[PDB]
Symmetry: C3
């Protein structure tokens, strides 16, 4: 059962659901709109070997970034062309990890689902690989998984990137995400690599 506008405000006011920073104009009919943080991570190894710690680079943009589909085959000359033509701070290819500005906390009876805005979907830019359910009890910013699938897309710092949809659990969870000792991503504060090698 999905929380509507006035439910979102109710839960936020009482601090049953935390959203920092919260803004009321981002509340929609049944979702909260989230915004693109300025920090990205790009991975650096030949293959993802999930049993190893993964090497990465971080970037912090000032205004904007060009995300290219994989196998756009970026040369230095191409990167430079795009930078001059479109005034973007960085050009990247394939997968890039980002983060929401909003930090969120969920009680043990609410579960959230992250999805990308349909305006982005309509330019074939996804900000999540999977269905996007955050666990009851979760604390942290949300890590985005950004891939473009048709042509390069310019994203701007702080733009609305997607939305959270909150729903009621049938019963509250005994252990929220934050409480579970094994939880990898509790208290996220920026964009954060995969830790699957802690499974």
């Amino acid at each position: 059962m999905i929380l509507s506008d006035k439910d979102i405000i109710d839960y936020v006011t009482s601090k049953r659901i935390i959203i920092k920073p919260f803004n009321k104009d981002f509340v929609g009919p049944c979702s909260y709109d989230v915004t693109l943080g300025d920090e990205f991570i790009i991975y650096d190894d030949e293959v993802y070997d999930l049993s190893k710690e993964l090497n990465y680079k971080r970037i912090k943009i000032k205004n904007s970034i060009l995300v290219c589909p994989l196998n756009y085959n970026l040369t230095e000359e191409k990167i430079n062309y795009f930078k001059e033509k479109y005034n973007v701070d960085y050009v990247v290819e394939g997968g890039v990890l980002g983060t929401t500005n909003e930090y969120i906390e969920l009680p043990n009876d609410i579960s959230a689902q992250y999805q990308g805005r349909s305006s982005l979907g309509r330019v074939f830019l996804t900000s999540h690989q999977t269905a996007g359910w955050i666990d009851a009890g979760f604390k942290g910013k949300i890590t985005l998984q950004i891939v473009a699938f048709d042509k390069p897309v310019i994203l701007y710092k702080n733009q609305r990137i997607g939305q959270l949809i909150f729903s009621k659990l049938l019963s509250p969870a005994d252990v929220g995400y934050s409480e579970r000792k094994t939880s990898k991503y509790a208290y996220q504060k920026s964009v954060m690599p995969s830790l699957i090698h802690l499974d």
Copy 2:
């Protein structure tokens, strides 16, 4: 809380939920099956600069279309080969936008989620980039975002392309999608480009 077959029929009968055109055999255990319209849009610029109006081409198929994965690198000679070999009206590469035949209206206490049929998913053809939640209050056909991820796929006009799953809001929304002055896509009547440059 998800509407089952008999709930879908109930809401439709009373016109609490509109689905034009409605067909009872498309009602399944907990979803309504939707069909592929004949109109597509393909985008035409080098990059998606979300702050500009985007250039596009429209196509209207008679029977079928071949959707290729990106970087299938289509030459005229290849397009011709596929057209002769498979009798398709058009061959396209990467992202293509489509539309459902069904126009839908949602009340302020129902939210819908569009997903693609698992038979298509099993040939690596997606018809949505994001998680697919339509807002409570929405009016319009649904724009599909079609990408193939393994090999080219033939889609036929009017085939069942995916499904709507409807769920109850905890409380009705104060402003439905259609009522909000800023809503971009209310009353959709075909496939429709992205308007993110109106954010």
Copy 3:
């Protein structure tokens, strides 16, 4: 309305929901964790013509598999290099179909949604094309649709690959998935090709 840990255990104990094999440590706040079976299917035709029976190959891994993004353009020499360097049993490109170890049965008032683990999503490995709703009444293992979108990824037999999220229907379905004569995928026992050509 989403089932929490203790709801999952309740439904399982009474055999309202079947999960074979069931393991209690895989129960999380509001989901059940599922594991990667050892059998995959790779498709073999130039294009997916949904009105034909599709040709495929099957593979059974001993330990692990390297999934490459499409257009990694795999030569025999490259396949051999990856096999020696990473000790994987198979190297594949683009889409590959897999299966969960868990066989599941759903009653007519519960619907499940499959999603991939966020740890995989963070390495741009998806295990489903579409939103992932299983119908009320469904019986079978779950077929995965695996694609990597940034760099090749090593998956291991029996690893946790994703999760099921279960929710309550507003009303029970008159016909569960298993009961419907037209249902394609009831009683799945491994990974299974697409049957869309039975529509």
